[PDB]
Enzyme design. Structure first.
Site, PDB file in Angstrom:
ATOM      1  N   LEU A 143     103.588   2.534  28.875  1.00  0.00           N
ATOM      2  CA  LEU A 143     103.907   3.946  28.808  1.00  0.00           C
ATOM      3  C   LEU A 143     104.323   4.298  27.388  1.00  0.00           C
ATOM      4  O   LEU A 143     103.921   5.333  26.859  1.00  0.00           O
ATOM      5  CB  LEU A 143     105.018   4.335  29.798  1.00  0.00           C
ATOM      6  CG  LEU A 143     105.552   5.755  29.587  1.00  0.00           C
ATOM      7  CD1 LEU A 143     104.433   6.757  29.821  1.00  0.00           C
ATOM      8  CD2 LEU A 143     106.812   6.069  30.481  1.00  0.00           C
ATOM      9  N   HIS A 144     105.137   3.450  26.762  1.00  0.00           N
ATOM     10  CA  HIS A 144     105.532   3.685  25.365  1.00  0.00           C
ATOM     11  C   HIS A 144     104.307   3.939  24.471  1.00  0.00           C
ATOM     12  O   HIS A 144     104.296   4.903  23.708  1.00  0.00           O
ATOM     13  CB  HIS A 144     106.373   2.516  24.825  1.00  0.00           C
ATOM     14  CG  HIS A 144     106.647   2.593  23.355  1.00  0.00           C
ATOM     15  ND1 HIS A 144     107.282   3.670  22.767  1.00  0.00           N
ATOM     16  CD2 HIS A 144     106.379   1.728  22.347  1.00  0.00           C
ATOM     17  CE1 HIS A 144     107.383   3.471  21.465  1.00  0.00           C
ATOM     18  NE2 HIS A 144     106.856   2.292  21.181  1.00  0.00           N
ATOM     19  N   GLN A 145     103.270   3.097  24.599  1.00  0.00           N
ATOM     20  CA  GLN A 145     102.009   3.275  23.861  1.00  0.00           C
ATOM     21  C   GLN A 145     101.307   4.586  24.183  1.00  0.00           C
ATOM     22  O   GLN A 145     100.836   5.284  23.295  1.00  0.00           O
ATOM     23  CB  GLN A 145     101.058   2.100  24.105  1.00  0.00           C
ATOM     24  CG  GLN A 145     101.592   0.774  23.522  1.00  0.00           C
ATOM     25  CD  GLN A 145     100.950  -0.482  24.132  1.00  0.00           C
ATOM     26  OE1 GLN A 145      99.817  -0.849  23.799  1.00  0.00           O
ATOM     27  NE2 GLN A 145     101.684  -1.146  25.018  1.00  0.00           N
TER      28      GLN A 145
ATOM     29  N   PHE B 139     106.469  -0.435  31.091  1.00  0.00           N
ATOM     30  CA  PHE B 139     107.275   0.443  30.254  1.00  0.00           C
ATOM     31  C   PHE B 139     106.793   0.393  28.800  1.00  0.00           C
ATOM     32  O   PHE B 139     106.684   1.425  28.137  1.00  0.00           O
ATOM     33  CB  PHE B 139     108.769   0.089  30.384  1.00  0.00           C
ATOM     34  CG  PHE B 139     109.700   1.128  29.742  1.00  0.00           C
ATOM     35  CD1 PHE B 139     110.066   2.288  30.431  1.00  0.00           C
ATOM     36  CD2 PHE B 139     110.185   0.948  28.441  1.00  0.00           C
ATOM     37  CE1 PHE B 139     110.903   3.229  29.847  1.00  0.00           C
ATOM     38  CE2 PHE B 139     111.013   1.885  27.851  1.00  0.00           C
ATOM     39  CZ  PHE B 139     111.373   3.028  28.552  1.00  0.00           C
TER      40      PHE B 139
ATOM     41  N   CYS C  80     110.125   8.414  22.167  1.00  0.00           N
ATOM     42  CA  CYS C  80     108.800   7.880  22.400  1.00  0.00           C
ATOM     43  C   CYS C  80     108.820   6.812  23.463  1.00  0.00           C
ATOM     44  O   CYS C  80     107.780   6.285  23.811  1.00  0.00           O
ATOM     45  CB  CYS C  80     108.190   7.363  21.110  1.00  0.00           C
ATOM     46  SG  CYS C  80     107.617   8.752  20.120  1.00  0.00           S
TER      47      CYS C  80
END
Length: 155
Positions: free
Chosen positions: A30-32, A27, A143
RNA sequence: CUGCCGUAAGGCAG
């Protein structure tokens, strides 16, 4: 409802890392990738959510338009985790389905992921799957892929 | 963990 595509990412069970630890890593990664793609039209849901055990479950579903989804997957954001995952095929969602908001909720009977960031410090990010609606009100995503208005199909 | 709005309650961002 221009977000009619999705992909399931499944965590493979691992002897040394509990699911919740992998998921947080998935997670964060994915944030990055979201912070790099830019935009606000990518959402997530955790389909195997368990309300009772306050567990996010072993699946991360990513929701996007057919081409938002493609731009995202052609990034090397999963480089390094892939061995820990199995991926479904990018598909059109089933229909009909309910829609819900999956949002960050900042005693909390809520599942969470643990992240880091400039400090070295760890923080919990709490997640709530919202009530089922018949349709989707417009709005975007953070984001973190979490609702800032937007809704995702639930199935 | 940090930080934003708000007079604090409430709320938000990475």
């Amino acid at each position: 409802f221009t977000m009619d595509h999705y992909l399931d990412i499944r965590l493979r069970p691992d002897p040394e890392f509990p699911p919740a630890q992998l998921m947080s890593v998935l997670f964060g990664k994915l944030h990055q990738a979201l912070v790099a793609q830019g935009g606000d039209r990518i959402g997530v849901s955790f389909p195997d959510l368990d309300e009772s055990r306050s567990r996010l479950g072993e699946r991360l579903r990513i929701h996007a338009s057919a081409d938002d989804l493609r731009a995202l997957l052609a990034r090397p954001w999963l480089e390094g985790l892939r061995d820990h995952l199995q991926f479904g095929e990018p598909a059109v969602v089933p229909h009909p389905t309910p829609y819900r908001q999956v949002s960050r909720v900042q005693a909390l009977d809520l599942p969470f992921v643990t992240l880091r960031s400039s400090t070295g410090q760890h923080f919990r990010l709490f997640i709530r799957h919202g009530p089922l609606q018949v349709t989707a009100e417009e709005g975007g995503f953070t984001c973190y892929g979490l609702s800032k208005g937007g809704f995702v199909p639930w199935f």
